[PDB]
Amino acid sequence: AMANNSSVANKVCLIVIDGWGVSEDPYGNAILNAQTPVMDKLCSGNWAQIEAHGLHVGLPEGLMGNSEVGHLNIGAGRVIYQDIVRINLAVKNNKFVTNESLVDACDRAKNGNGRLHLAGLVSDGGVHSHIDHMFALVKAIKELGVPELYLHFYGDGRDTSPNSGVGFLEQTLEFLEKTTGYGKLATVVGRYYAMDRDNRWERINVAYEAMIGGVGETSDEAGVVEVVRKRYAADETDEFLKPIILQGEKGRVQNDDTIIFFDYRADRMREISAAMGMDRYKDCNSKLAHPSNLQVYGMTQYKAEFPFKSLFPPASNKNVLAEWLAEQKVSQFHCAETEKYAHVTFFFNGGLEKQFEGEERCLVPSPKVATYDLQPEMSAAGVADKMIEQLEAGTHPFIMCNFAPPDMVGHTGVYEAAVKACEATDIAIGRIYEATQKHGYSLMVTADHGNAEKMKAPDGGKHTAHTCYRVPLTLSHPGFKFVDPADRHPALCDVAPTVLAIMGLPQPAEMTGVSIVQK
Amino acid sequence: XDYPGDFCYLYGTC
Ligand SMILES: [Cl-]
Ligand SMILES: [Cl-]
Ligand code: NA
Ligand code: NA
Ligand SMILES: [Zn+2]
Ligand SMILES: [Zn+2]
């Protein structure tokens, strides 16, 4: 318990069903065709349908939702923009030139030796980086007046075709010469060497010695594409390009230089960025002298133990629901079975392992079966038992759980199993509902994304994935009507503001979602 | 998994 528990205007029980989306199409629809008399009634009259995929939850458009993203958005009361979406917005709205860390890196160059490097994967793969991001970096750096800019081009061939490198090379050459008239290519080397993540420091060292010492094949802007073509004819493709060296010593990473890695995916940046700025050049086992007084910046955070500034550092996620309730001295209860336990803790609480004052947790063991189609009810009955225990106790003004079966049994593709999982879930929801009415709680039912409403593809094949359908938001309290946001569809970011309103509690400024009920 | 919105959130576990 906690001091302000009774100050609440309504106690609230929040059920997050996993993989339960709203489809009116009945073909392969495990929810519709299951016996679901409880959700049939809760999803009628005054209920809402809210978005849980795509840009509504901070993911690229057209991308299905998932448990990690959905629980994060529900618990956070705000859209958390995924790196790709975030940086692409910055690029389109010309926001690199005002980016705090970038201005800081250019200021460092301008106040120092004038020299700045860009390094990263040059292609349109979109997994680790995007060439468009690098171009926007060059344009902004030019406008910020940095004297001297060098690029270190890492060849892809893995997220793009093995012989696409020469085209991105041509683009980059032409862009630097004709579009910016500013910036110079200094290095070309394959990701095999530059972007190892398996502690193969003999691979890293190839890239490192090219950047630091110019160890590789000499060329220039007139010749480098031809050099690459010859490597292709020799059967050495983008991923495996051995170093090509441009601009001579001018283009090496030298004493006092500044460097920006522009990849947004951290795993393949940690080795080379630590060789440059985290005192791990020793593992490269090079005979070259390591430059002194380097400063490294990353596009995103590569490791929290690194001293590097990030152009797009993590969302801090201050005052997600779990934190805000403890701040208001209100206790809370989070319950899931094993398969979704992280989702009601780590992810619901903001994507980090932090448990707040007054927060109680309960884990219900998932059944020990080979696949969950073999026990489609999983442990839903047990989660409901623990929630009913809490409702009868009345201790916690906010309680929430996850029900695993529709998502986890849906991933098996077994339609009749998915039906049984939706029936087990509905039964458990009905038992929680009856306990809430007997002990003075309002019930809200939602989901983190869809899944079990589409168990068959059009060709009748099994559909084992999440979906882009809307999810429910229900509310048993009769003193409220569901209303839409002014400017957009409702989405998961609105669940927590609505709970707080119903609870009579304040909304923190960091929750930029909105309550979607009116009193 | 290291920070909210990082690459692992694109598709998640499942
Ligand atoms: Cl990859
Ligand atoms: Cl990879
Ligand atoms: Na049904
Ligand atoms: Na499905
Ligand atoms: Zn889920
Ligand atoms: Zn799933």
Dig out the tokens for A422 from the structure.
């939706």
With residues binned 3-state (H G I as helix, E B as strand, rest as coil), the percentages for chain A, rounded to 5, are 40, 15, 45
Beta bridge partners of A491: A51
The experimental method, as deposited, was X-ray
* Contact by Cβ (8 Å): A224, A169: yes
CA distance A116 to chain B (A): 26
Contacts of B11 in chain A (CB under 8 A): 66
* Contact by Cβ (8 Å): A138, A180: yes
Tell me how far the alpha carbon of residue A443 is from its chain's centroid.
29
Rg (CA), chain A: 27
**β-sheet with A48-50: strand ranges across:** A48-50, A471-473, A441-447, A11-17, A398-403, A332-337, A359-364
Helix-then-strand count for chain B, H and E? 0, 0
Q: Resolution (in Å) of the shown entry? A: 2.1
* Contact by Cβ (8 Å): A438, A50: no
User: Which residues does chain B break after (C to N > 2.5 Å)?
Assistant: none
Instruction: Flag if B8 and A68 touch (Cβ within 8 Å).
Output: yes
Q: Is A67 a catalytic site residue? A: yes
Helix-then-strand count for chain A, H and E? 18, 17
Instruction: Flag if A314 and B7 touch (Cβ within 8 Å).
Output: no
Taking alpha carbons only, the member of A64, A65, A28 closest to residue A459 is A28
What phi and psi, each to the nearest 5 degrees, are found at residue A350? 120, 10
Is residue A434 classed exposed, middle or buried when 0-12, 13-18 and 19+ CB atoms within 10 A define those classes? Answer: middle
Contacts of A67 in chain B (CB under 8 A): 12-14
Q: Report the SS3 class of residue A461.
A: coil
- How far apart are alpha carbons A497 and A348 in whole angstroms? 14
Sign (positive or negative) of CA dihedral A201, A204, A209, A212: negative
Interhelix angle A270-277/A201-213, nearest 10 degrees:
50
Closest Cβ–Cβ partner in A84, A264, A317 for B4? A317
- How far apart are alpha carbons A119 and A187 in whole angstroms? 9
Taking alpha carbons only, the member of A186, A110, A190, A188 closest to residue A143 is A110
In the 8-state DSSP scheme, what is residue A240?
G
Contacts of A68 in chain B (CB under 8 A): 8-9, 12-13
* Contact by Cβ (8 Å): A422, A34: yes
Contacts of A264 in chain B (CB under 8 A): 7
- Ligand 6 center–CA A344 separation, angstroms: 14
- How far apart are alpha carbons A67 and A77 in whole angstroms? 16
**Nearest chain B residue (CA) to A18:** B14
Residue of A55, A83, A467, A492 best to disrupt the B interface, most CBs of B under 10 A? A83
A359 sits in which H/E element: strand A359-364
* Contact by Cβ (8 Å): A464, A474: no
Q: Are strands A217-218 and A244-245 parallel, antiparallel or unpaired?
A: parallel
- Ligand 6 center–CA A427 separation, angstroms: 21
CA distance A258 to chain B (A): 25
Nearest 5°: the CA angle A458, A464, A469 is: 70
Q: Which of A339-376 are b and which e, b meaning 16 or more Cβ less than 10 Å from the residue's Cβ? A: bbbbbbbbbbbbbbeeebebbeebbbebeeeeebbebb
Interhelix angle A165-174/A224-233, nearest 10 degrees:
180
CA distance A169 to chain B (A): 26
Beta bridge partners of A187: A152, A245
Closest Cβ–Cβ partner in B1, B6, B11 for A83? B6
What torsion, rounded to 10 degrees, do the Cα atoms A25, A28, A33, A34 define? -130
A84: contact with B, CB 8 A cutoff: yes
Beta bridge partners of A185: A151
- Ligand 2 center–CA A378 separation, angstroms: 34
Closest Cβ–Cβ partner in B1, B2, B10 for A59? B10
User: What ligand is nearest to the CA atom of residue A417?
Assistant: 4
